[model samples]
Target: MSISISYSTTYSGWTVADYLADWSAYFGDVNHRPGQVVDGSNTGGFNPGPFDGSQYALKSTASDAAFIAGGDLHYTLFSNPSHTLWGKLDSIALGDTLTGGASSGGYALDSQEVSFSNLGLDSPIAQGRDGTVHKVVYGLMSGDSSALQGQIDALLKAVDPSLSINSTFDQLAAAGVAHATPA
Candidate 1:
């Protein structure tokens, strides 16, 4: 197939109107087609997705060279709020290699950040590596993690003014965004 995808990190705003529509009209190839265009980028200093770090590669049935050169595929990190994936570290990023020896083999790869990165997911579960049990949270269209936070706050505040929050890390802590698992 032809990998005619266009990727970018900047786009239009996403509001209640967009959300109500499931964001279908805001995307290029909402159905994971070839010529789709994906949006999103790492947020603030956050690596994105829950695990933050989860490295797992997927071997594809498609062309190795073209896939690798297509674009820098993000390391779809595994997720879990309590513990780590492999060791003590939070997790790993998406794998850097795409070959038969990676691990699992089944389908081919796409050319855009989307087509794979939850095209409509606010921070949906990403397609884990071909072989491992992973589920990342990323591929948002509104922007990165940082931008999403504000957007989320705006939406909530629209419903309840008290839900509005500050953008500072300190404010985040006070707002409970930096809270720990309930005890």
Candidate 2:
């Protein structure tokens, strides 16, 4: 059996760039980090790369009216049965934390896992008689304009207590914050 996992979320009053910036502030890029020893083997840690508008491809205009842009992450769990890999991947996918904080907006983002085995041809995955297995863990993060602004402000503040809306990306860069700026 094959296993795959995916996640997505929608937002309002924020652009793709803003959304990604916020994510980067909270979770640094895993791809750029160093690997550590796990289970007696050196392995890379799981880090969803910063949003940066590069991790996600844009959807069509008619996809959702309220959403300006949506993003997704996909991963394949196994080619052969290995309980260790499955457990680790499953824990990571299902163990995401979205706590209530100034930077997370007033509302907390929560996640859930949904399984689809056999439904019809419209299923997300296609398989023959054996059928493919899919374990989907999705997150929904939504807030109003005030909450959105609050998150942006709080994230910046966390990076630099004295920073404000007037602060430039250069200022943030100078402050040792990690993120991509316009070229």
Candidate 3:
């Protein structure tokens, strides 16, 4: 089975480089090496493997003021041969919530959502790493403020018990971030 997840956000007062730097800090490279790109340039950062055996490597990409005046940034997680869709999606959603912090350019996270599909599986016998056959389950989330916050908090806490929902919605409001809607 294969999975693809794409997340995007809009912000002012930051460049592509700033966005990339913020992501690297929030989601460290697969090897945890120093001097990582952690930020944007002509080419985005690359994580050669999964982070801590479950997280997906962040592949960064950006548009040239195409949608928003300052430009829009995107980070996508491509499925690994050994990873599960559920685990990777959880990490990506959790990471999206943290990008609004001061360290990640203080971007408002104007908009974000995750979508995934596993159409390759046609039988229950197709084994996955989790010892079960994954099904063709997919969905999208956007502009549902309550669901957004609740989901983020749940996923975040599931990953890091030490983190708190410290002024997350407040930050989102302050930044005037917009939430997208599913079509």
Candidate 4:
């Protein structure tokens, strides 16, 4: 497939921490790695049909690869309170190796959508916390963990030149750095 680079959905006024926090919450679980990406109308899983993360990777072509190469990329937000980011990922960031295997067949590529009713909760200055907050999270139910590992391998290669993908994932999983169990 030809590589396609594009923005899924751009969100504004979001800090790096916000992005990391959301990423951690959604992709924290190894079991929930293979998620899907739906149209804009649907928040997380559009049409109630979940696509494997590997499928997303296949469709993404090169967009995911490009993302890894380009760090500190900013996304623009159209709506407030409720927002979604949808884009084909062609690339990922590279890095050093840690302690896990690079090509283990136990990983999966996962996608997620996080929504909050009260934006203030993410704000440190907001003295008053109110309103109902909901984060509709959806991911791929069935997929090849090895394909997901391929995506992670690509990212680990970018993050650490010496770190193996499996090692990195294992270390990260062990440390509980970005750990989230699916319900």
Best-matching candidate per TM-score: 2
Please, what are the lDDT tens digits per residue for candidate 3 over residues 1-183? 222223344332233223333433443323312354354331212122222222222222222110010111122233343322232222233223213322333233233332212212222222433321111111111111232234444433444553223423223234332132342
- Worst ten-residue run, lDDT, model 2? 82-91
Model 1 scores a TM of 0.20
lDDT measured at residue 13 in model 1 versus the true structure, 0 to 100: 26
Local accuracy of candidate 2 as per-residue lDDT tens digits, 27-63: 3322211242233121221223221110211111221
Off by over 4 Å in 1: 1-147, 155-165, 180-183
What TM-score does prediction 2 earn?
0.24
Please give, for residues 1-183, the per-residue lDDT of candidate 4 as tens digits: 211111113322232234433444433332322243334322222111232121111112212210011111111133332232232233331111111111342222333221111111121112211211111111211211233234444444454454333342224334332222331
Better of 3 and 4 by lDDT: 3
The 10 consecutive residues of candidate 4 with the worst lDDT sum are: 65-74
The local distance difference test score of each candidate is: 0.25, 0.26, 0.27, 0.25
| C-alpha RMSD by candidate, in order | 16.0, 19.1, 16.0, 18.3
lDDT at residue 149 of model 1 (Cα atoms): 34
TM-score of each: 0.20, 0.24, 0.20, 0.23
